[PDB]
């Protein structure tokens, strides 16, 4: 099976990648404390509550009891408790679910960040070719399988040699084709190179980052960051 | 500070309490977790009873290793504060003015130095606001003080709210002084301007 979001981001960081793993919470009280302690470091910052359930379309979905969205903004730790209280212990309905619901027993609480660009990127083991291949496109919010059927020319594909792995020219070109420029290019290479170090050194089948974004830091420094992660085995 | 900075938060005020660390290793961890919540953020390391900017958890470790167990009374603990974008520096204090026998609120737009120096060279920079201990600070007075410092929009009301919470720490603690140097206008990670107490001192 695939591991949860915040678990994937953690492994990505364990190999030198920048990802917003936030902090998990198995209760709405715990989630409130997380946002509260974070206000000590960045007072006035908003928060984002992300249901931890193995299925896509969380931002699109909704909850039975009236709440809309699996990824919702929160202005205060109290709002974090509200949202979290409606998530933990309830069922979420997304596109991958139809209407059978998925039991949500935990959520992830991360700080609200300003996003400048959103990209798709994944490291897939092309079995037909027996080699890894890197997919990407400048259409973060859309979905990989949706874009593929309607626009496969929207995707950039880069087969990877199993020996040396990524080629610095391959990665530099991919970052350049995605519209990146300046320090974000090398930063994108560093993270993407870390994604392979996660893909290969962990015997993984897929490392999907949707969206891989250009975010601003609290001091407004642009840095590549994985705002979502799925790792299949 | 931790007690005070929490008291402001206890009574409904914004205060960057950061987090204390009793060793360079601990300091490096605090900065690491913050990169899970706001990746790429910088950090500020404060030596507790001086302040250097750090770009990475490893830099924080370096700076902490220079402080803990060294000069500037001995320093045996540091406070790791996320690097927040600070726009304006203000100074604000509440005092039992023995001369007038009533609480008074002093404030200036030069929050980068001791109040002693500002008065001498610039006496126009300070703003006295005598407060009736019973009637307390009146909304009219605090709004007048807010606009006296160059605040507009939600900040004007945002200032009034924090000033009130500070007087409660002064009233409900019977404290002789409540000093906020600096009181900053800060941008949140999403570029929202808010008032925040960046340093606190409570005496008796
Ligand atoms: N920390 C964050 N701050 C602001 N927006 C965020 C943050 N994390 C995620 N988002 C936004 O929320 C959207 C939905 O989250 P995501 O993890 O992609 O869920 P899903 O793709 O399953 O719907 C993302 O596409 C992104 O635009
Ligand atoms: Mg996603
Ligand atoms: Mg910004």
Scored b (16 or more CB within 10 A) or e, A189-214 reads: bebbbbbbbbbbeeebebbbbbbbbb
Contact criterion met (CB < 8 Å) for A218 and B39? no
Chain A partners within 8 Å of B37 (Cβ): 20, 22-23, 38, 41-42, 110-111
Residue bearing tokens 């984002």: A48
Annotated catalytic residues of A are 120, 208
CA distance B186 to chain A (A): 9
CATH of the domain at B52: 3.30.1490.20
The count of C-alpha atoms lying within 13 angstroms of the C-alpha of A222, restricted to the half-sphere facing its C-beta, is: 14
> Into how many domains does chain A fold?
1
B40 vs A18: CB contact, 8 Å cut-off? Answer: yes
Is residue A50 helix, strand or coil? strand
List A230's β-bridge partners, or say none. A208
Q: Determine whether the annotation assigns residue A210 to a binding site.
A: yes
Q: How many residues does chain B have?
A: 204
Burial degree of A178 (CB within 10 A; 0-12, 13-18, 19+): buried
Q: What residues contact A110, with CB distance under 8 A and at least 6 apart?
A: A20, A21, A22, A23, A47, A48, A50, B36, B37
First to last CA, chain A: 6
Nearest to A211 by CA among A160, A151, A136, A145: A136
Write out the H or E segment, with its range, that includes residue A102.
strand A102-103
d(CA B92, CA A195): 49
* Residue A191: partners with Cβ closer than 8 Å, 6 or more residues away: A17, A18, A212, A224, A225, A226
With CB atoms and an 8 Å threshold, state whether B188 touches A218.
yes
Find the CB nearest A44 among B39, B41, B192: B192
The response to whether residue A101 sits with its C-beta less than 6 Å from ligand 1 reads no
Q: Residue B194 pairs with which residues in a beta bridge?
A: B186
Helices (H), chain A: 5-14, 28-41, 77-87, 144-150, 168-177, 183-201
What is d(CA B181, CA A208) in angstroms, rounded to the nearest whole number?
Answer: 47
Q: What does the DSSP assignment read for B73-92?
A: --B--EEEEE--EEEEEEEE
Q: Using an 8 Å Cβ cutoff, are A126 and A132 in contact?
A: yes
Q: Which residues contact B26 (CB under 8 A, 6 or more apart)?
A: none
Give the integer Cα–Cα distance in Å for A75 and B173: 30
Q: B154-171 and B2-10 helices cross at what angle (nearest 10)?
A: 120
Report how far apart, in Å, the C-alpha atoms of B10 and of each of A33, B5, B169, B196 are: 14, 9, 9, 14
For residue A193, give Cα distances in angstroms to A118, A215, B135. Answer: 18, 19, 64
Long-range contacts of A201-206 (CB under 8 A, 24+ apart): A201/A15, A202/A11, A202/A231, A203/A233, A204/A123, A204/A231, A204/A232, A204/A233, A205/A124, A205/A125, A205/A232, A205/A233, A206/A122, A206/A123, A206/A124, A206/A125, A206/A230, A206/A231, A206/A232
Residue A212 beta carbon below 6 angstroms from any ligand 1 atom = no
Give the Å distances, CA to CA, from B160 to B101, B145, B155.
Answer: 23, 8, 9
Determine contact, residues B78/B37, Cβ cutoff 8 Å. Answer: no
Chain centre to alpha carbon of residue B27:
21
- Exposed / middle / buried, residue A103 (Cβ in 10 Å: 0-12, 13-18, 19+): exposed
What are the backbone dihedrals phi and psi of residue A60, each rounded to the nearest 5 degrees, phi first? -80, -35
Q: Is the peptide bond before B182 cis (omega within 30 degrees of 0)?
A: yes
- Looking at all shown ligands, the one closest to residue A70's CA atom is 1
- Closest to A41 measured CA to CA, from B81, B41, B44: B81
Q: How far apart are CA A220 and CA A57, in angstroms?
A: 29
B7, exposed or middle or buried, with CB in 10 Å at 0-12, 13-18, 19+?
buried
- Answer yes or no: do A45 and B190 touch at CB < 8 A: yes
Q: Using CA positions, which residue lies closest to atom 17 of ligand 1?
A: A228
Q: What angle do CA B87, B90, B94 make, to 5 degrees?
A: 150
Give the span between the Cα atoms of B175 and B4, in whole angstroms: 11
Q: Give the list of residues 6+ apart from residue A83 with CB closer than 8 angstroms, or none.
A: A49, A67, A72, A74
Q: Is B70 helix (H, G, I), strand (E, B) or coil?
A: strand
Instruction: For residue A66, give the 3-state DSSP assignment.
Output: coil
- Residue to probe by mutation, ligand 1, list A4, A35, A71, A95, most atoms within 8 Å of CB: A71
Range of the domain at B80: 1-85
Residues with CB under 5 A from ligand 2 (ion): A 210, 228
The CA-CA-CA angle for residues A130, A133, A137, to 5°, reads: 155
β-bridge partners, A225:
A213
CA–CA dist A5, A211 (Å, integer): 12
Residue in A111, A112, A220 closest to B85 by CB: A220
Query: Is A22 near ligand 1, meaning CB less than 6 Å away?
Result: no
Secondary structure letter of residue A89 according to DSSP:
T
Cα separation, B108 vs B118, whole angstroms: 8
**CA nearest to A225 within chain B:** B39
- What does the DSSP 8-state code read for residue A22? -
Determine the residue of chain A that is closest to B194 in CA distance.
A44
Closest CA to B34 of B78, B75, B84, B87: B84
Q: CA A78, CA A85: separation in Å to the nearest integer?
A: 11
Count the helices and strands in chain A (H runs, E runs): 6, 13
Give the minimum alpha-carbon distance from B123 to chain A in angstroms, rounded to a whole number: 32
Nearest-angstrom CA–CA distance, A195 and A217: 21
Ligand 1 test: best mutation among A22, A227, A230, most atoms within 8 Å of CB?
Answer: A227
Residue A4 has what DSSP assignment?
P
Measured between alpha carbons, how far is B188 from A114 in angstroms, rounded to an integer?
10
Cα–Cα distance, B157 to B135 (Å, whole number): 19
Residue of B nearest to A44 (CA): B188
Q: How far apart (Å, rounded) are the C-alpha atoms in residues B157 and B195?
A: 10
Helix (H) or strand (E) holding B103: strand B102-108
- DSSP, res A154: G
């Amino acid at each position: 099976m695939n591991i949860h979001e915040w678990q994937s981001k953690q492994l990505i960081q364990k190999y030198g990648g920048r990802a917003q793993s936030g902090e998990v919470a198995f209760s709405p009280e715990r989630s409130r404390d997380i946002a509260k302690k974070l206000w000590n470091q960045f007072p006035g910052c908003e928060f984002v509550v992300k249901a931890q359930v193995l299925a896509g379309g969380r931002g699109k979905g909704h909850w039975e009891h009236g709440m809309q969205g699996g990824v919702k903004l929160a202005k205060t730790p109290e709002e974090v408790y509200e949202i979290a209280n409606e998530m933990i212990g309830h069922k979420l309905i997304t596109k991958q679910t139809g209407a059978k619901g998925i039991n949500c027993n935990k959520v992830m609480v991360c700080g609200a960040v300003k996003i400048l660009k959103e990209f798709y990127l994944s490291i897939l083991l092309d079995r037909a070719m027996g080699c890894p291949v890197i997919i990407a496109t400048s259409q973060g919010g859309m979905g990989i399988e949706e874009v593929a059927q309607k626009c496969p020319e929207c995707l950039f594909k880069v087969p990877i040699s199993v020996k040396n792995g990524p080629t610095n020219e391959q990665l530099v070109k991919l970052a350049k084709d995605l519209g990146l420029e300046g320090d974000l290019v090398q930063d994108c290479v560093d993270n993407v190179k870390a994604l392979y170090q996660v893909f290969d050194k962990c015997d993984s089948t897929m490392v999907e980052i949707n969206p891989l974004g250009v975010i601003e830091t609290p001091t407004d420094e642009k840095v590549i960051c994985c705002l979502d992660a799925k790792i299949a085995f």
